[PDB]
Design a binder for these strands. Structure first.
Ligand SMILES: [Mg+2]
Lengths: 474, 419
DNA sequence: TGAGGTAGTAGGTTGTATAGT
DNA sequence: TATACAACCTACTACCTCAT
C-alpha cells in the first residue's frame, strides 16, 4: 500500500500583497495585483456587434451569478472586482458591414474566404490602432456567428451560396487574426456575438441554442480577467515563488504544408512568477520525428532559444536565473539538452521536465462520491512523480475534473533536482492562467497554451517577431 | 462607545452580497457585525445581536432585498434599530442597502421605505463608494485599512467549513499489478517452420515476429495444430532470457536492449488478455486502439454482480460497464484498466453509430460519481477473476500470467470532509 | 456549461529499400 | 520489379478547452 504525499495549494497574490487560492475570490476581495487606469475598449464588429458588446459592458457593471456560487464564485461587477471602469460609454468603434461581410465571406474557398475577412479585420484594426491619436487598451473582435460558422477548415458552405467559384482547387480565423496582428503588437480579445448575447440567439424551438444561465457570471470572470490582463496589468502573482527561477515551455506544431513532413515551427514560453509570460519564437526546422512521434531540436537553434530567453531574462531581471526549468510533454534527447547545457551559465541549474498526461494511475477514492482532492501526489522515483492538478477542491466543494481525475506524470527527464519542488512549482504554475480565470490550471501554464500557440506560430511564418508577452499570443 | 457597522440580512438569498459587503467593509477598516462571521450557540444569540445593535452599533445596515423585508429574523433585527434610532437621534443610523433590482414599494418595510436609497443595484462598486462617501459626510469611525483582517476572516471564517483537513483516506488504483511471470522468456529460431506471411493472432497464444526468431511465453512445443513440421527444432537452440532479469535492466544485449524487451512483453500481456476475453463470458466492444469488454444483458442475475450493477439502462438503451487492458511495465508491472460505458438498444446487439454512443456515454457518465466508477470496475475485475486472488492469462499451456484482481491501494493522510 | 477540439496510441494501410531479373 | 519490411496515418475514445 503505497502512500501519497500532499502538496499544499500554492497561494497567488492580489492587491495589497494579500494572497489566497482562488483568483475569482482573490480579485473579488481585494482586486488586481496592479490596478489599472480604465480600459479604453475598441470594437471591430457589426453595428449589431456593438449593441451586443455594449450589452456586456453594461451587464458586467452589475453582479452576475453562476448556478451555484460555491463551485463557481459569483462575479461582483467589473468595477467592484477590478476597482476600475471598463465603460460602454467609452467605445472606439471600427465598423464592419454585412456588405463587407457578404462580399468577402461568400468565396468558394474557405481559405480565400478566411484569409480575407482576417485581412479585413486587421486593416480595420491596424488603421485604427496605427492611425488613431486616441488610444484603445484592448481591441475586441466581435465575430458575428456567420463568421465563426464558416471560417474554419472542414466547414462546408453550400455550393448554393458561393458567388465565385474557387480561383484554384492556417484556416482558423481567430488564431490567424492574432497571427497577422502579431508583427505589430496589439491586444486582440476575440468574442462571439452568440456568447455575449446568448439569450437573444433563440433556436427553432425558441429556447436559446446555447443556454448559459448556469454559468453566466463565470463568463465575465474569464472575459474580464483576460480583458483586464490584455489591457495592461496582470491580475495576480504567484505568492511564494523562490526568487530567480525561469520556466520555459517548449512548444512545437507540425507544419503539414511541407512536402517533407518534419517542418515544425518552434517556440519557448518563459514564465517567471507572473504568467504574463514571454513567448520566444523559434524559427522553422526539422523538429517532428517520424520514427519516435516526438518533437526535438538541433543544438544550434536550441542554443539560440536558451540564450534568447536567458538574455531577455537578464535584460528584464538584471542577472541570470539560478534555476531554469524547461517543460515539454516529451523526453529530451541527450544532444538537444547538452546544447542547452553549453549556453547556460555555470551555476544556474537547468531542469528539463516532461509533463505527460498519459492515462496512468487513475486514483479512485475508496469512500464518498467525490474524488481525491487536488494536491495529492504519488512519487514514483526521486526523478519521476504523479501529480493531481485535478480532482476535488474543498474551497470549491467540486471536482476540477468533472469525472475521475487523471494525474500527470512528471519526470525530470534531464537535469537533477528535488521532485518535491518540481511537483510544487508545477502545482503553482496551474494557477497562473490569466485568460481562463478559474481556481487552478490543469496543465501548468508553461505547456497549457502550447496547442493554441502552435497554430499561431504556423499561421504566420513569414514574420520574425520579437519575444512577446502572452497578451499578443492569446 | 460605539464603532461597529451591524449588517442585517436575509440568508441565504443575500449571502453573496452580505458576505461581499461586510468583507469589503472589514478590509476597508470598518468594524462589521454580521451573523456571517460567527457560529453562535447561545440563547443570547439574539441578545448578542440585541446587545450589539443596542450599544456598540454605530450604523445599522440592512439588506433591502425582497427577502430582506419579508423575513421574520431581519424584521426582528430591524425592530431594535428603530427602537435605537431615537436613542441616537441621528437620522442616517439605518441604511437600507437596496441590492434588489426588483423591489416593489409594497414589499419594503414602512420604516425603511422612507429612507435614502443606497444603490447597489446599478453597480456593486458605485454603491460601495456611495456607502463610504456617506460614511465620510457623517463621521462614522474607521481604522486605517488592513485587508489582512479582511481575508483573515474569509480564509478562517467562510472557508472554515470546507478545506484540506489532516484526514486519512485510501484510494484504489486501476493499475492491477501482475503477480507471476513465466520463469523464462524464450526466443525461437523457428526458421523454416515460421511463415512470415501467416498471422498468429489466431494462434490462440501470444506470439509476434521479432527479427527471424520467434517471441512468446509459450514454449516452442505449444503451437501444433496451426503450425506443422516444427518437431524439427532443437530445444536447446533458442535463447532463454531470464525474465527476472529483464525488469531490472540486468538484461542488456547489444543485439537487443532491455527497452526493446520491455516493449515486447506488452503486446503479449495485451494479447493474452484479448485471448483470455475470447473465453471469459463478456461480449467485446471494438475501438480501433484495442478492445473494450462489456458483459451482455442477463449474464449476471438481474444484471448485478456481487451487489454491484455493471449493466443498466438509460432511456431506451441499455448501458453496460466495459473495461480495457493496458499493460504497463513501469514502475511496477501492472494491468491498467480504463473504464468504459458501452451501449445497446437491446440486450446483446451493439449500437451502430458512435455519435449516439458518444452522446450516451457522456449522458450516462454524469450519473456515476467517484464511489460508482470505483465499485463497478473493482467488481468487474472481481467479475473476471478465475480464483480468489487474481486473474489468469494464458500465454501457453504450462505458462501463465497472474494479475492481482485488487489494485494497489494508496494511503494518504490529508483529505476533505464530504459535503 | 458543453458542444467542440486535441491528444494520446495503437495499429492496419502505405511508401521505401532490398533483392533478384 | 518483385516483395520483406520498414515508418507513417487514421479512426475512436477519454478528456479538456474555447470565437470563454
Ligand atoms: Mg479563451
Amino acid at each position: 500500500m503505497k502512500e501519497l504525499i500532499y502538496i499544499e495549494e500554492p497561494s497567488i497574490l492580489f492587491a495589497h500583497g494579500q494572497k489566497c487560492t482562488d483568483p475569482r475570490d482573490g480579485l473579488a476581495l481585494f482586486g488586481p495585483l496592479n490596478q489599472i487606469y480604465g480600459i479604453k475598449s475598441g470594437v471591430v464588429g457589426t453595428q449589431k456587434g456593438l449593441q451586443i458588446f455594449k450589452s456586456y459592458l453594461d451587464k458586467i457593471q452589475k453582479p452576475i451569478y453562476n448556478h451555484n456560487n460555491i463551485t463557481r464564485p459569483m462575479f461582483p461587477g467589473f468595477e467592484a472586482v477590478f476597482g476600475c471602469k471598463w465603460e460602454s460609454q467609452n467605445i472606439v468603434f471600427k465598423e464592419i458591414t454585412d456588405e463587407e461581410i457578404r462580399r468577402y465571406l461568400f468565396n468558394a474557398s474557405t481559405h480565400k474566404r478566411t484569409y480575407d475577412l482576417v485581412t479585413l479585420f486587421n486593416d480595420k484594426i491596424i488603421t485604427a490602432n496605427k492611425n488613431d491619436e486616441e488610444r484603445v487598451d484592448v481591441w475586441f473582435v466581435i465575430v458575428p456567428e456567420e463568421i465563426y460558422k464558416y471560417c474554419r477548415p472542414n466547414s462546408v458552405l453550400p455550393n448554393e451560396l458561393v458567388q465565385t467559384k474557387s480561383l484554384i482547387s492556417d484556416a482558423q480565423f481567430h488564431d490567424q487574426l492574432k497571427a497577422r496582428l502579431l508583427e505589430h503588437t496589439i491586444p486582440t480579445q476575440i468574442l462571439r456575438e452568440s456568447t455575449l448575447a446568448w439569450r437573444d440567439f433563440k433556436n427553432t424551438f425558441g429556447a436559446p441554442i446555447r443556454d448559459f444561465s448556469k454559468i453566466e457570471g463565470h463568463l465575465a470572470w474569464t472575459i474580464s480577467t483576460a480583458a483586464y490582463y490584455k489591457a495592461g496589468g496582470k491580475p495576480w502573482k504567484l505568492g511564494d515563488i523562490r526568487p530567480g527561477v525561469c520556466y520555459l515551455g517548449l512548444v512545437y506544431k507540425k507544419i503539414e504544408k511541407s512536402k517533407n513532413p518534419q517542418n515544425a515551427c518552434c517556440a519557448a514560453q518563459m514564465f517567471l512568477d507572473n504568467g504574463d509570460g514571454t513567448v520566444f519564437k523559434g524559427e522553422v526546422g526539422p523538429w517532428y520525428n517520424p520514427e519516435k512521434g516526438e518533437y526535438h531540436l538541433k543544438p544550434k537553434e536550441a542554443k539560440a532559444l536558451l540564450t534568447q530567453a536567458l538574455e531577455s531574462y537578464k535584460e528584464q531581471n538584471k542577472s541570470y536565473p539560478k534555476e531554469v526549468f524547461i517543460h515539454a510533454r516529451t523526453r529530451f534527447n541527450d544532444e538537444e539538452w547538452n546544447a542547452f547545457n553549453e549556453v547556460t551559465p555555470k551555476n544556474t541549474n537547468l531542469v528539463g521536465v516532461t509533463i505527460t498526461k498519459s492515462k496512468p494511475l487513475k486514483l479512485y477514492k475508496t469512500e464518498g462520491a467525490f474524488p481525491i482532492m487536488r494536491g495529492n501526489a504519488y512519487i514514483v522515483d526521486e526523478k519521476k512523480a504523479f501529480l493531481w492538478t485535478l480532482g476535488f477542491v474543498p474551497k470549491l466543494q467540486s471536482t476540477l475534473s468533472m469525472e475521475v481525475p487523471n494525474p500527470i506524470f512528471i519526470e525530470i527527464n534531464k537535469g537533477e533536482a528535488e521532485i518535491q519542488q518540481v511537483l510544487k512549482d508545477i502545482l503553482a504554475l496551474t494557477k497562473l492562467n490569466y485568460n481562463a480565470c478559474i481556481y487552478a490550471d490543469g496543465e501548468p501554464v508553461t505547456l497549457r497554451f502550447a496547442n493554441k500557440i502552435g497554430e499561431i506560430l504556423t499561421a504566420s511564418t513569414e514574420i520574425k517577431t520579437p519575444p512577446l508577452a502572452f497578451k499578443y499570443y492569446i | 462607545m460605539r464603532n461597529k457597522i451591524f449588517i442585517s440580512h436575509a440568508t441565504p438569498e443575500d449571502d453573496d452580497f452580505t458576505r461581499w459587503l461586510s468583507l469589503k467593509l472589514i478590509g476597508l477598516g470598518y468594524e462589521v457585525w454580521c451573523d456571517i462571521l460567527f457560529l453562535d450557540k447561545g440563547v443570547d444569540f439574539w441578545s448578542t445581536i440585541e446587545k450589539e445593535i443596542r450599544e456598540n452599533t454605530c450604523k445599522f445596515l440592512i439588506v433591502s432585498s425582497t427577502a430582506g423585508n419579508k423575513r421574520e429574523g431581519v424584521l426582528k433585527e430591524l425592530a431594535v434599530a428603530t427602537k435605537v434610532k431615537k436613542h441616537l437621534q441621528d437620522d442616517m443610523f439605518i441604511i437600507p442597502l437596496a441590492i434588489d433590482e426588483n423591489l416593489s414599494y409594497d414589499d419594503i418595510n414602512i420604516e425603511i421605505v422612507r429612507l435614502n436609497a443606497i444603490d447597489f443595484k446599478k453597480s456593486w462598486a458605485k454603491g460601495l463608494q456611495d456607502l463610504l462617501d456617506a460614511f465620510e459626510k457623517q463621521n462614522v469611525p474607521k481604522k486605517p485599512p488592513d485587508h489582512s483582517k479582511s481575508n483573515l476572516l474569509y480564509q478562517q471564517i467562510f472557508l472554515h467549513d470546507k478545506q484540506a483537513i489532516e484526514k486519512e483516506e485510501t484510494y484504489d488504483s486501476n493499475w492491477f499489478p501482475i503477480i507471476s511471470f513465466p520463469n523464462e522468456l524464450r526466443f525461437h529460431r523457428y526458421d523454416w517452420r515460421l511463415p512470415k506471411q501467416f498471422d498468429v493472432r489466431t494462434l490462440a497464444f501470444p506470439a509476434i515476429r521479432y527479427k527471424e526468431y520467434l517471441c512468446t511465453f509459450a514454449w516452442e512445443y505449444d503451437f501444433i495444430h496451426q503450425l506443422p513440421k516444427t518437431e524439427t527444432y532443437n530445444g536447446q537452440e533458442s535463447i532463454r532470457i531470464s525474465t527476472s532479469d529483464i525488469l531490472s535492466g540486468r538484461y542488456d544485449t547489444d543485439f537487443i536492449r532491455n527497452y526493446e524487451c520491455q516493449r515486447l512483453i506488452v503486446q503479449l500481456i495485451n494479447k493474452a488478455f484479448e485471448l483470455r476475453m475470447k473465453d471469459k463470458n463478456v461480449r467485446e466492444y471494438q475501438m480501433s486502439k484495442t478492445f473494450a469488454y462489456w458483459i451482455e444483458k442477463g449474464k449476471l442475475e438481474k444484471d448485478k454482480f456481487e451487489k454491484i450493477k455493471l449493466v443498466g439502462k438509460q432511456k431506451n438503451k441499455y448501458w453496460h460497464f466495459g473495461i480495457s487492458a493496458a499493460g504497463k511495465l513501469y514502475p511496477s508491472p501492472v494491468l491498467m484498466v480504463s473504464s468504459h460505458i458501452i451501449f445497446t438498444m437491446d440486450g446483446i446487439n451493439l449500437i451502430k453509430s458512435k455519435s449516439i454512443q458518444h452522446s450516451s456515454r457522456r449522458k450516462q457518465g454524469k450519473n456515476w460519481w467517484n464511489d460508482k466508477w470505483r465499485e463497478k470496475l473493482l467488481a468487474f475485475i472481481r467479475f473476471l477473476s478465475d480464483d480468489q486472488n487474481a486473474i489468469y492469462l494464458n500465454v501457453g499451456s504450462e505458462e501463465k500470467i497472474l494479475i492481482s484482481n485488487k489494485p494497489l491501494k494508496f494511503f494518504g493522510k490529508m483529505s476533505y470532509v464530504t459535503p
